[PDB]
Amino acid sequence: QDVFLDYCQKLLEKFRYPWELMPLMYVILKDADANIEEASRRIEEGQYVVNEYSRQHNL
Amino acid sequence: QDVFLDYCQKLLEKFRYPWELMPLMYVILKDADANIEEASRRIEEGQYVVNEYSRQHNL
Structure with a gap:
């Protein structure tokens, strides 16, 4: 569990996301x-x- | 695909995320x-x- 959240933080950092998006890194990983x-x-x-x-679509 | 992205936007809006996080809603959905x-x-x-x-963990 502890190691998994470590991978989540690695993923977060790779894509330059703020800590508030850790839940989304959790789901994707x-x-x-x-x-x-x-x-x-x-x-x-x-x-x-x-x-x-x-x-x-012109955005 | 067009409808799928509408669902991604519905998920985005439910959790009050900004447009920049559409890629993450795409993955999760x-x-x-x-x-x-x-x-x-x-x-x-x-x-x-x-x-x-x-x-x-004191955060």
């Missing part, structure tokens, strides 16, 4: 079975999809 | 197969766990 690489890839996919939805 | 109730429950679990780790 738990969903990915504590696979930090896969969690990172997933966040990058979200960032892409959101960015392009915005660009392709 | 995708992981939950677009089940918004389950996405909510999971974020609530993360909120509990993080809050409890903080309280039980």
Whole structure:
């Protein structure tokens, strides 16, 4: 549990998120079975999809 | 895909997050197969766990 929250903080820091988003890092990493690489890839996919939805809709 | 992003925005708004966190709503809701109730429950679990780790560690 303690180590898991350590990975959560690593993920948080990689993406320059504030501590208030630790709950979201918890969910994403738990969903990915504590696979930090896969969690990172997933966040990058979200960032892409959101960015392009915005660009392709005048945002 | 368009409707999926509307659900992501509904989840974003429920938890009072700014637009910048849409990528995280995308991941969590995708992981939950677009089940918004389950996405909510999971974020609530993360909120509990993080809050409890903080309280039980002087934060």
